[PDB]
């Protein structure tokens, strides 16, 4: 029961806090993702245009 | 007894300044998150314009 | 000394690498008051997110190793799948976008 | 006096060593098990002295 109490009042709050932090980090990296995609579109258009003329 | 009262009052001051520091650290993490979100949003807008 | 047995066990089983230990300390109280490596030595706070995502993933993987219960194991499986899907897709995106921005630079020298 | 454990819960909570047939917490935290067994072994060794 002491191990269970660690799981639900020590490991459980730790894992919930890790869950919120990792979900905020997932949001962080999908914003890194779409900003890197937007730079991708920038370089792709710049390359295609400059090669075009 | 006076020194014990001083220790208690200074521990209360320690707790108050620790609450202030916790608020400051929460505001610093919030500032980091707000910087990231705001600069990426501005990057999105500016890149759409580009 | 006041840390719970969870972080104590995690630190003990982890190597004495300062990076991982400082990550654990920051996780225990939000941020790490690390000592500046510059000649102007001073204490500065560093957030958990400043640590690389891979180290945090390894920490939580170790946590699931020491607590392998089915809900935790499934949560780690889902989060690691999201890791290797989203962040790793972003990782090929990042490496190939450094390469393709180098292509842009070569183009800009070209025309 | 003696209740059988859920084998799933016991296995997840406890590392089992069949070579010595011992039981420990997976996190390695010392419980009454470690205290009792360590005390017994220390008495055995002090007797060996």
UniProtKB/Swiss-Prot annotation, chain A:
Residues 19-49 form a coiled coil. It is found in: Nucleus; Cytoplasm, Cytoskeleton, Spindle; Chromosome, Centromere, Kinetochore; Chromosome. It comes from the Eukaryota. The modification Phosphoserine is found at residue 52. Component of the DASH complex that connects microtubules with kinetochores and couples microtubule depolymerisation to chromosome movement; it is involved in retrieving kinetochores to the spindle poles before their re-orientation on the spindle in early mitosis and allows microtubule depolymerization to pull chromosomes apart and resist detachment during anaphase. Belongs to the DASH complex SPC19 family. Component of the DASH complex consisting of ASK1, DAD1, DAD2, DAD3, DAD4, DAM1, DUO1, HSK3, SPC19 and SPC34, with a stoichiometry of one copy of each subunit per complex. Multiple DASH complexes oligomerize to form a ring that encircles spindle microtubules and organizes the rod-like NDC80 complexes of the outer kinetochore. DASH complex oligomerization strengthens microtubule attachments. On cytoplasmic microtubules, DASH complexes appear to form patches instead of rings. Present with 639 molecules/cell in log phase SD medium. This is DASH complex subunit SPC19. It comes from Saccharomyces cerevisiae (strain ATCC 204508 / S288c) (Baker's yeast). The lineage of its organism: Eukaryota, Fungi, Dikarya, Ascomycota, Saccharomycotina.
Curated annotation (Swiss-Prot), chain B:
Signal peptide: none annotated. It is found in: Nucleus; Chromosome, Centromere, Kinetochore. It comes from the Eukaryota. Belongs to the NDC80/HEC1 family. Present with 1160 molecules/cell in log phase SD medium. Component of the NDC80 complex, which consists of NDC80, NUF2, SPC24 and SPC25. The NDC80 complex is formed by two subcomplexes, NDC80-NUF2 and SPC24-SPC25, which are joined end-to-end through their coiled-coil domains. It has a rod-like structure with a length of 570 Angstroms and globular domains at either end. The NDC80-NUF2 globular domains are probably directed to microtubules, the SPC24-SPC25 globular domains to the centromere. NDC80 probably interacts with SMC1 and SMC2. Also interacts with KIN3. Interacts with DMC1. Acts as a component of the essential kinetochore-associated NDC80 complex, which is involved in chromosome segregation and spindle checkpoint activity. This is Kinetochore protein NDC80. It comes from Saccharomyces cerevisiae (strain ATCC 204508 / S288c) (Baker's yeast). The chain holds residues 544 to 593 of 691 of the full protein.
Swiss-Prot record, chain D:
It is found in: Nucleus; Cytoplasm, Cytoskeleton, Spindle; Chromosome, Centromere, Kinetochore; Chromosome. It comes from the Eukaryota. Component of the DASH complex consisting of ASK1, DAD1, DAD2, DAD3, DAD4, DAM1, DUO1, HSK3, SPC19 and SPC34, with a stoichiometry of one copy of each subunit per complex. Multiple DASH complexes oligomerize to form a ring that encircles spindle microtubules and organizes the rod-like NDC80 complexes of the outer kinetochore. DASH complex oligomerization strengthens microtubule attachments. On cytoplasmic microtubules, DASH complexes appear to form patches instead of rings. Belongs to the DASH complex SPC34 family. Component of the DASH complex that connects microtubules with kinetochores and couples microtubule depolymerisation to chromosome movement; it is involved in retrieving kinetochores to the spindle poles before their re-orientation on the spindle in early mitosis and allows microtubule depolymerization to pull chromosomes apart and resist detachment during anaphase. This is DASH complex subunit SPC34. It comes from Saccharomyces cerevisiae (strain ATCC 204508 / S288c) (Baker's yeast). The chain holds residues 51 to 99 of 295 of the full protein.
